[PDB]
């Protein structure tokens, strides 16, 4: 399962643009709240990575293979911050339900 997940990570292809996994999340309301709660350096790296991926998609290029994002290396930075947004979101929802 670990090797097949690495193969699927190579087949997804966002590592060839230098992106992380959390860069590829669709910005819903909860995702934008989690992005707003990021520290300044992580937010700046995320915006630069997104801008570089957009530039590479503009020129129809990819990064060189040494510059790709290694599956093992990818960091799920937004995840911790996101869970909270969802948790808080649900708590609020439940309160209203009841």
């Amino acid at each position: 399962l670990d090797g097949f997940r690495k193969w699927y990570y190579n087949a997804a292809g966002f590592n060839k643009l230098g992106l992380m996994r959390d860069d590829t999340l669709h910005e819903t309301e909860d995702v934008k709240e989690a992005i707003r709660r990021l520290p300044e350096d992580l937010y700046n790296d995320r915006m630069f990575r997104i801008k570089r991926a957009l530039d590479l998609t503009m020129r129809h290029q990819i990064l060189p293979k040494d510059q790709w994002t290694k599956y093992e290396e990818d960091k799920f930075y937004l995840e911790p911050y996101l869970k909270e947004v969802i948790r808080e979101r649900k708590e609020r929802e439940e309160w209203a339900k009841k």
């Binding site: 700046n44 790296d45 530039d55």
Partner: peptide
């Protein structure tokens, strides 16, 4: 112009 644009991140 854009297709030559070089981006650099300089924290």
């Amino acid at each position: 112009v854009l297709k030559s644009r070089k981006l650099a991140y300089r924290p």
